[PDB]
Structures are given as structure tokens and as C-alpha cells.
Amino acid sequence: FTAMLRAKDVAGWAVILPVVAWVASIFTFLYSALLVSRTFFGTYKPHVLKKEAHEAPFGMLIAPIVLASLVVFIGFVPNVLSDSVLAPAVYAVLYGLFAPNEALDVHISHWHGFTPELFMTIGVLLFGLVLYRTFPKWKKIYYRLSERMSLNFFYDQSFVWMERGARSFISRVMNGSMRTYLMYIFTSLVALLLFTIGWHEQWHIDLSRLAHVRVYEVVLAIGILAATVTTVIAKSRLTAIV
Amino acid sequence: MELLMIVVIGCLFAAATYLLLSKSLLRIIIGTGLLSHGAHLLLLTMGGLKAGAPPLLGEKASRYVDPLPQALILTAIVISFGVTAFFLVLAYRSYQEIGTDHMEGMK
Amino acid sequence: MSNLLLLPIVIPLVTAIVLIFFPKHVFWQRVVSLAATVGLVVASGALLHRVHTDGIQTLNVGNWPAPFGITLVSDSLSALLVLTTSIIALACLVYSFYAIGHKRETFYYYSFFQFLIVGVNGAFTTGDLFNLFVFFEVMLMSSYVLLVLGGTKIQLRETIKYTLVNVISSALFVVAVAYLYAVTGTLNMAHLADRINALGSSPILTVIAVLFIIVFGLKGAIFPLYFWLPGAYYAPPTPVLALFGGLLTKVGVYSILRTFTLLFTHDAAYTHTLLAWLALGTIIIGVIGAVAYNDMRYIVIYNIIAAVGVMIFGISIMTPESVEGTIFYLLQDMVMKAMLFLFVGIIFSITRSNDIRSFSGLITSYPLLGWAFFIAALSLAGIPPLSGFIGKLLIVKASFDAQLIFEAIVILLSSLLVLYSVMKIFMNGFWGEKKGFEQKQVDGRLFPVLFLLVLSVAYGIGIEFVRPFVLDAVNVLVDPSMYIEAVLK
Amino acid sequence: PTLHIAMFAPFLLALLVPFFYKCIRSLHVGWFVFPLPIALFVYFLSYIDDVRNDEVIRATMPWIPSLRISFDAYVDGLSLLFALLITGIGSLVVLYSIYYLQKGKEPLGNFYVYLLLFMGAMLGVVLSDHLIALYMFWELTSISSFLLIAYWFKRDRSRYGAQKSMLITMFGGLLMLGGFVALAIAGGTYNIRELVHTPLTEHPLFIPALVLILFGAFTKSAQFPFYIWLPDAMEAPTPVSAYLHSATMVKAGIYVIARLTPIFAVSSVWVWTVALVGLVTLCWASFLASKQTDLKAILAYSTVSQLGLITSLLGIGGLSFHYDGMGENVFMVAVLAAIFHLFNHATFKGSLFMVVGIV
Numbered sequence A: 001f002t003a004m005l006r007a008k009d010v011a012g013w014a015v016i017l018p019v020v021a022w023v024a025s026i027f028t029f030l031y032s033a034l035l036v037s038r039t040f041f042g043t044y045k046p047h048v049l050k051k052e053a054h055e056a057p058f059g060m061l062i063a064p065i066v067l068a069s070l071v072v073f074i075g076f077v078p079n080v081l082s083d084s085v086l087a088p089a090v091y092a093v094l095y096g097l098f099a100p101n102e103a104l105d106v107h108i109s110h111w112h113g114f115t116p117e118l119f120m121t122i123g124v125l126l127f128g129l130v131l132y133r134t135f136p137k138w139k140k141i142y143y144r145l146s147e148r149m150s151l152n153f154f155y156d157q158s159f160v161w162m163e164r165g166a167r168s169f170i171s172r173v174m175n176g177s178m179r180t181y182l183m184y185i186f187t188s189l190v191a192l193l194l195f196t197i198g199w200h201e202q203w204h205i206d207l208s209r210l211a212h213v214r215v216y217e218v219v220l221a222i223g224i225l226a227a228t229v230t231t232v233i234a235k236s237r238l239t240a241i242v
Numbered sequence B: 001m002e003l004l005m006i007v008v009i010g011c012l013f014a015a016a017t018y019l020l021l022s023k024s025l026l027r028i029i030i031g032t033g034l035l036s037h038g039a040h041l042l043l044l045t046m047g048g049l050k051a052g053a054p055p056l057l058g059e060k061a062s063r064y065v066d067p068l069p070q071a072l073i074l075t076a077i078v079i080s081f082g083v084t085a086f087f088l089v090l091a092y093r094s095y096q097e098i099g100t101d102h103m104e105g106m107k
Numbered sequence C: 001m002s003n004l005l006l007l008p009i010v011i012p013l014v015t016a017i018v019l020i021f022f023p024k025h026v027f028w029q030r031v032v033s034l035a036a037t038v039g040l041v042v043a044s045g046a047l048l049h050r051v052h053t054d055g056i057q058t059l060n061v062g063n064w065p066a067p068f069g070i071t072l073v074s075d076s077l078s079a080l081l082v083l084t085t086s087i088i089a090l091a092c093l094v095y096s097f098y099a100i101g102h103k104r105e106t107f108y109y110y111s112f113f114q115f116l117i118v119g120v121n122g123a124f125t126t127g128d129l130f131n132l133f134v135f136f137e138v139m140l141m142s143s144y145v146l147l148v149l150g151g152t153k154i155q156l157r158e159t160i161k162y163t164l165v166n167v168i169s170s171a172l173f174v175v176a177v178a179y180l181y182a183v184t185g186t187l188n189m190a191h192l193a194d195r196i197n198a199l200g201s202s203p204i205l206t207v208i209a210v211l212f213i214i215v216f217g218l219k220g221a222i223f224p225l226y227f228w229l230p231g232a233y234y235a236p237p238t239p240v241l242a243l244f245g246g247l248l249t250k251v252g253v254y255s256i257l258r259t260f261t262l263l264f265t266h267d268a269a270y271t272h273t274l275l276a277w278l279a280l281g282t283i284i285i286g287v288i289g290a291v292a293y294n295d296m297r298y299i300v301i302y303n304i305i306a307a308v309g310v311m312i313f314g315i316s317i318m319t320p321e322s323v324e325g326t327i328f329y330l331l332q333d334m335v336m337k338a339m340l341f342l343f344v345g346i347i348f349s350i351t352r353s354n355d356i357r358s359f360s361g362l363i364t365s366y367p368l369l370g371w372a373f374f375i376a377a378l379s380l381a382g383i384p385p386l387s388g389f390i391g392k393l394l395i396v397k398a399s400f401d402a403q404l405i406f407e408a409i410v411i412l413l414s415s416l417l418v419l420y421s422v423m424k425i426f427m428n429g430f431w432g433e434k435k436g437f438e439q440k441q442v443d444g445r446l447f448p449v450l451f452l453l454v455l456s457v458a459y460g461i462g463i464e465f466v467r468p469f470v471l472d473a474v475n476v477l478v479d480p481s482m483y484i485e486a487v488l489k
Numbered sequence D: 001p002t003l004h005i006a007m008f009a010p011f012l013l014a015l016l017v018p019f020f021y022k023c024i025r026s027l028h029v030g031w032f033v034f035p036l037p038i039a040l041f042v043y044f045l046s047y048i049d050d051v052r053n054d055e056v057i058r059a060t061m062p063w064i065p066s067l068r069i070s071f072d073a074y075v076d077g078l079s080l081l082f083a084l085l086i087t088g089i090g091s092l093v094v095l096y097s098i099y100y101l102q103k104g105k106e107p108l109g110n111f112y113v114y115l116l117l118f119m120g121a122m123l124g125v126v127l128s129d130h131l132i133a134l135y136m137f138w139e140l141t142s143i144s145s146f147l148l149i150a151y152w153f154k155r156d157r158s159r160y161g162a163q164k165s166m167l168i169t170m171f172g173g174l175l176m177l178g179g180f181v182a183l184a185i186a187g188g189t190y191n192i193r194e195l196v197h198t199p200l201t202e203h204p205l206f207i208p209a210l211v212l213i214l215f216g217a218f219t220k221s222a223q224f225p226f227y228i229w230l231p232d233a234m235e236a237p238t239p240v241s242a243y244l245h246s247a248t249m250v251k252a253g254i255y256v257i258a259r260l261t262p263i264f265a266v267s268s269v270w271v272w273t274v275a276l277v278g279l280v281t282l283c284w285a286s287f288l289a290s291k292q293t294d295l296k297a298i299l300a301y302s303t304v305s306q307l308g309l310i311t312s313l314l315g316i317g318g319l320s321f322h323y324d325g326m327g328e329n330v331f332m333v334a335v336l337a338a339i340f341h342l343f344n345h346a347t348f349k350g351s352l353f354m355v356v357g358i359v
């Protein structure tokens, strides 16, 4: 809260930013309180549960004890782990910027002093207390507004859309008939070659290489044109073969 | 003379393309044959068709017809004959075991 | 001595010939083809060391000079592709020993195998356009027969389809050679490269370059010329399909690469923006097909199409970083697609079904196969300790350096989608409870797949070993003056 | 150099796990995993004296020297804070998983292989100075966590959660790679400590690198709207939930933001994007955490809320770089607050998951 309140002093719209973060802390307290208050409190159920004795073994409990002890140790003693570890992390993240280094040190050594963020935490505590006791009253409204916006719905339907669109694409363009694929290949050939010719200007048509035409090739060309025409318009297949 | 050969190989290409896009398989193999003839005549035409002696050094003429495209055409002819004979026996096998000629009906 | 360059061509050829004499003796077929394939691997490795030590290797076939006869040229890129072909051929051959039944290999199967590797090996090393044509038809004819062999109804139908398409594209390559011979007058790569660079400001050369794009994109499937490949590769048996997916579509990529790094250099803007848009369309079609299907063979087919699109986009930039990246991605993608088809074949052998939704629970019975497929999938995607990382990394770096932000983002999202497809196979097939299959002990055929996987992992680790070959390849691709001064002496 | 055999020691022990698992059938395999994080933790206590008196630890292992790629390691206060967190909570989670799982009913070698791969990958993420090495360790983190979420593969909801978490985190990681590449072109080099001492705002690739790195870092640490995968990753085992979604993986994007802050916080897009999306996901997860009816979803939305708090404080600490009025220098306090709560969060959040696992 100290970092967020001193960040709204550079832009006006950033005044929106801490109070939103403030209600986040409200929400935080709620589930955490609800966690403990619906895990260990209440009453015991001797009909659905399994064991008559629920004493856990100690070896399972070793590592949570060590983690909770480290929690309590950096709780009551915050100075030595800060000065050992946390300061060169800040000098690493903010490289090339520390022309002095004593202000960071005297802020690490700072722990107490009356801050305006203290009553902010007190208000967090009081509002979470008055919000948790009435939680079975605004329960249905919260359930329906939580149903009102999620993000697994969008992702699941996006994958259904993607697989169905790809499958319908390959059901459209891959029919299996060889005539259609020949049409695609021939059309692509024609389009690429005609666009490549039309993009240029095709200068220098020189007819000087051309040979003198003679009568025998003319008559034989008319003959094989006749054979070509009678092999494309033939009704029977023997006519096309011959 | 090369212009007339160009328009007649273009008519062979149009005929071959129209036969390849048909419904029966024997028409497709006929189109394969016509496309091969068009390609071989195109090799001969683009090699040049100016008048000279046949490519034989026994005849002592001044200028000869180009020897390279004839050798290239003969290579292409024997390769195309091998592939054409294989594809015709393949069509015979398909008529024998499947039992149809309709190319669109082949699914 | 100087005939070492022909040893990737001559060794399988002779072998194919001597496999004609004894069809019914399947044991000696296996022994002779295995020994010749191992000798092919050794000779190709010796050729790669030869082209690394001293310069680019040129051999006139006869003793005839450089413009006027057939010249065979092995640079570093062709030697790398020949060695990769040799490794893929050996793994497919041992899987063929375990996989192909008796009846299909009494009828000349290993001969057709050796003719296919003759065709691809000859296509990677040649110095003539029309000789390259002849090697394309050797390759395609052997692929026709390997597709049709066995004679069930499915491979009859799609052999008809595949044969029709390749006949049309063969005729189109004939007419392209005809047009270019009318313009230039020569037929070898180096001297017609010199003649194109002597009259490089003519529009007909641009038209013929677009025609070669159309032909070689019919060979290696580009959008919108890809339409034959799903059914045609859904037809054949598994080692034949591993040969097809590992080798056939990638020699068209090499032909596009050699064409636009050697022949057509002037007026680069139009041809390169055409290659860029066709590559983006190819990537989009591949990832749509990979997302769409719940069938393993179709998933690997559309991963082939997507990887071809990525390689063509790497070709479409004339920077040495992009050329280096597409060479790395080319080698690893050949090996990886052959590996994945062999995986799909083993899984089909176990499940007796190809539908992902039909079976579940294979980790509980086949742990080595499951974690091998997991590592293969993550190496396909491009995770950095694995094989296919440095290629797409250099492609993305060269696209950002030339200010193509959107295309690099398309590449990264395509990597995401191909990962999603193969991991869909892994998560629905291997994980889950056991319902779909019956316990069947696999044998033998798992080991060539594991050999390919170990070579892919060792490739991803040792980029520093495999890199100076690729550096010499890039140094000869972005500078064709060394190519045209090596041949034309 | 003795830290080369520290970064790559969990990988070697992850190789050696199934040997001890199927060759020693009496003793629980987790005990054999137990000393190594302890050892690493003790080793990471050895640098505090050198880091308090402003000295750093540099190491180099070249991988592709001609493409100019190395595994570098740079050790300063931030990397030590994260490494001490990782190793301490790792040893405690290993102990809790020894006493939590069973022997003859659970595949345990898979569990400790995946966990130790994740620990080595996270220690690689933190200690790295090279961008491609950082991305490599990032991706290994994503894959190992994907394996850990789906530990029970015979149940459907674990596979759904693993698939969703995989797709979201891979999406963020790939766009993170794109931003790393754009930044490495914008600067001359690849190492992070030389990108600080060079100007980068006079370059067209600065803003796309900013947006892509920032997108990936928001995607890893479960920000808005990418917090979606973390409540469905609660079908993991409870030590996996504790360790991964308390202390290690959900703070990787926090580390990347705080690590690249001396480069990108000279612009306003970085600092206001970070601050605003942190406040938005803080309030949104704090609202949603009270709806749930089981313990682990409550703790997941709790985790998302405190991560949003930490990254909003990182945004205000990015605002610290521009100017401070007449030596007031107040914005630096925000940095300390973030780091404090960072450390703070890890500790108690781990304990909370352990508690609910017990009950």
C-alpha cells in the first residue's frame, strides 16, 4: 500500500489504481478467513468420515513445521534476512541506477513510524470481518455473478471452433475426385504464367530467326489438326484410339 | 514455319488438357499420349527448323540440322513409352479387379 | 581415384542388376542388398570427407570438356544429402527385412528399392538439367512400381492417381527444358548459368523460372500443387512409405534451391516474393491438415507438407543465415520423417487399426516404444536439446533480420501446431487405460527406428561437429562463381 | 569450476534413479534423491558472503562456439534468492513426498526422474546468462511439468489438465523465443550482461521484442488472461502442486520480468503493461477465489492473485528508472516490496498445500 499510494502522484488517473487494489485485499481476507473457518471449525461428522483416529505421522509434519517456522522467523525478525539476501536482489533488479546506496539501507532498517497505510489495514480487517459473517446472504448473487464471466468457456469453444473449421476445410477442398485436383493444378499453372507475362512488357519481338514456311508442313499440319479434332469430338473410344 | 508448329502444338496441348479432365480413364491415357507428342514436337521446334542436311557426316553439306534436340527427343520417347506401357497395363489391372472405368466414381 | 563421386550412383545400380538373377532366393537377396547398402554408406562418408578436405569435386563423364559433355558435380550439400539418403536407405532396408512378407519380396522388391536409391542419389549429384530429368524418371518409375506392388485395390487406385500427376509434371519439365534451350542454347548448369547472367534483364527468364517453380512444386508438394500427396501416401506399405516421405519430396526442395541459388539471380524480387507467398500457403495447409485428422498417417503426411513449407520459406531469403537454417532443417527433417513413418508402422502392427480413438494404454505394455515416440515428437517440434532446433532458430533469426515479423510468428505457431498433432497421437494413444489392443511381442523392427532416433539425438547434440560441412555448403550456394569456375576450367 | 557439476548434477542423478529404483527394492528411492538438493542448498549458502560485498560469479561452458552459443552462468543477488528458494523447498518437498506416496502401489522412479529433471531445469533457468540456454532450460521446465501434471495417466482429467497447460505454456515459450531472437538482433550479442551496457531504443526491433518477451513472461506466471491452466493443474500429486505451483514454475516469468527490467523499463509500454495486467489479475483472482468448494482450487486462485500483486509491484519498480523528484526516490521501495513478498509467498504457500494434502 505504501508503494501504490506513492505511485498515483505522477498521473491523475492513477488515483484510481490503489483503491481498486484496496478492495482486492478485502477479497483476499474473505477466502482466507473462509478457508480456516470452513476447514477446522464447526462440528465433527461421525458418519461420513473414515478414521476413528486422525493423528498424522510426524514425518509428514516435519516440512510444514519448518516452513511455518521460517514464516514466523521472517515475521518477528525481518532485518537479518533482508540485509543478507534481499538488498543485492534490489541492487540487481535496479542495475546502473544506484549512485547513492544509503537511502535503500536506511529504508530497509526502517520498520515502524506512524503511516497512513496502518488504518488502511485496519479498515481491511474490519470490512473483511463485516463481509464474512453475512456471506450466506449474498451467496446466490455471488454464485451467479461468478457464473456470469469465466474464461474456460471461451478457450474450450475456441478449440472446438478451430478443429471444426480445419475439418470442414479439408472436407471442402479435399473431395477425392481427380478431376477437381487437375482443375486446381491447371488453373494455378495458367494464373501464375499469365500473371508473370502480364507483369512485364515483353519487348523485342524479333521475327528474323523464323524459317521460310513450306507447303508440305502446311498440309501435314492440317492433317494432324484434323486428327486432333476427331480425337476430341469422337463419340466412341476406338475412334479416339485410331 | 515455327509459328505454324507453335499453333499446332498449342492445339495438341489444348486437346490433351481437355482429355485429361474427363470422366473415363482411357480418354485420360489418350490425353497423356497427345501431351507427349506435343512436348516432343515442341522440343524439335524450339531447337530450330532451318533447312540443312540430316545429321550425318557422310553427306558433305555446308550446314546441318541441330543434333542435340533429336537425341533429347529420342530419350524422352523411350522414357514416355515405358511409362505409357506401365500405365496401360495398370489400367487393365484396374478394369480387371475393381470393375469400373469412371474416374470420378473411383473413391 | 576421381571416380569416387560415382560410387553413390554405381554401387546400388550394379546391385539392382545382380538382384534380377535370383528372385526366389530371398536370403541372398537380403544378404547382397544389405552388404551393398553398408558399402554405400561407407562410400558416401568417404565422399563427404573428400569434398571437405580439398575443394568441390567435378568429373566429366567422358574425357570431354565441361560445356560439351555430361559433368557430375559433388559439392558439400549434395554429399550431405547422399549420406542422409544412405542412412535412411539402410534403416528402411532392415525394416523391410522384418516387415515385407515373403510374396512381395520374391517379386523383385529389393531391385526396385535399389533403383529408387539410384534415382535419388543420381538426382542429388548432376550438372545437367536433362540428366536431372532422366534421374527424376528413374526415381519416379521405381516409386510407381513400389507403390503398386502387391496389387490390392487401394494401391491400384492411388497408383493411377500418382502416375497421372507425375506424367503431367514430367511433360511440363520437358517443355521447360525446351524453352530454356531455345533461349540459352546450352544444357549444363554452369554454362547456362553464365549465359543467363549474360542476359539477365529479360522477362522470358522470369517466366521460365516460374515454370520451374511449378514443375518442382509438383515434384515436392507446394501449395497449390500439393493435392496428389495425401491419398498417394495413404496407399503404400510402411517401409516404402518411409522411403517416400524421407526422400521424394525433398529432392524437389533441393532442385528449387539449386535453381534459385545458381541459375536465376537477376530480378530476384518477383521470384522471391512468389516463393514467400507459396511457402506461407504451404505452411498453412500443412498445419490445417495436421490439426484436422485423427489418423496417424495423415498427421505425418501434413507434417511433411508443413516442413516443406518451412524449407521453402528459408529458401525465399537470399541470406547465408537462412540458407544455413534450411540446410540444417532439411537434413534433420529427412531423418525425422522416415523415423516417424517407421513408428506409425510399428503402432499399426500392434493395434491392427490406424484410428487414434480406437486404442489407449500402450505405455503399460510398450514403454520403450512410447518414450521413443515421445522423444521423436519433441525433436520434431524443435525443443532445443533435440535435433530440429538450430535450423528453425536460424530461419527465424534471418526473417527478423530482414523485417518479416508476421512470417516468423507464423513459423513459431506452426511449430506449436505440429507439436499439438504429434502429441495428440502420444496422449490419446499411449496414455489412458487399456482397451484397444492385444499383447503382441514386437521384434527386430524396433531397432532401425531406435538407430534413427539415436542419430537424431546425436545430431541435436553435436551441431559443432556437423556445422563446417554446412558452412562450406553455404559458401558455395551464396557464391556460384566458385561453382562456375570449378566446372568451366 | 564446481558449479558446472552443480547445474548438471540433477540430470545425472535423474539418469541414475531407475538403477537404484529396481536394484534396491528395500529402501524407498526418495531417500537417495534426498541429499542432492540439500547439497545444492548448502552450496548455495556458500555465495552469500561474496554477493553481499557486491561481487558476482561468472562461468562459461561453450556449446556451439562458431554460432556463438554457450551455457553461461551469472550469479548475483537475484539468482541466489531464486536458487536458495528452489533448493530449500525442493528438499522439503522431497521429504514430504517420501512420507506421502506409497511403495508397492506407486511408480516412484518416474516421479523422482520427472521431479529432478524439473529441478535441474529450474536451476538452469535462474542461473543462465545466455538467451538460448535460458530458452532451452525454459522448455525443459515446461516438458517436465507437463509430465508431472499427468502422473496418473489412467484418469481423464489429469490428461485434460496436462494438455491445456502444455498448449498455453508452449505458446508463451515460443513467443518468448521470438522476443529473445529479436532482442539478440537488436543488441550486438546474446549474453544478458552485455545487453545492459548498450543502447537499444534506437532500433526497430525493440518494441516487438518487448511485446513478445512480455507476452511469454505473462504466459508462464499465470497472468491475465493466461491464468486458465493453473486451476486445472490441480490433479497432480500434492508435492507436485506445492513445489511447482508455489515456488518454482509460476515465478519463472517473474524472474524474466525482473531480470530484463534494466533493459526494457526505459520505455513506458513495459512498465504500464506489467503494472496494469498485474492489478487486473490480482483483483480478478481475488474475486474468483471465494467461489470454489475444494481446497486446491482456492489455493490456485490464491497463487494467481499474489503473483499479480508481485508483478504489479515489479511494474512500479520499472517506473523507478525514469526520474525521482528531488531525491525522493520512493519507487525503489516497490522493488523491495515485490522481492519481499516474492520470498514470503513461496514459504507459506508451500506449507498450505502440504497441509491440505495431509487432511
Ligand SMILES: CCCCCCCCCCCCCCCCCCCC(=O)O[C@H](COC(=O)CCCCCCCCCCCCCC)COP(=O)(O)OCCN
Pocket: A220, A223, A224, A226, A227, A230, A236, A238, A239, A241, A242
Ligand atoms: C491418315 C493417316 C496417315 C498415316 C497412316 C496411318 C495408318 C494407321 C493408323 C493407326 C491404325 C490403328 C489401327 C487400330 C485398329 C483399327 C480397326 C479396328 C477398330 C475400328 O474399326 O474402329 C472404328 C474405326 O474408326 C472409324 O471408323 C473412324 C476413324 C477415323 C480416323 C480419322 C483419323 C484422322 C486422320 C486425319 C488426316 C491425318 C493426316 C496424316 C498424314 C471405330 O468405329 P466403331 O466404334 O463403329 O467400330 C466398329 C466396331 N464393330
Ligand SMILES: [K+]
Pocket: B035, B036, B039, B040, B076, B080, C170, C171, C174
Ligand atoms: K514426354
Ligand SMILES: [K+]
Pocket: B036, B037, B040, B041, B077
Ligand atoms: K512423339
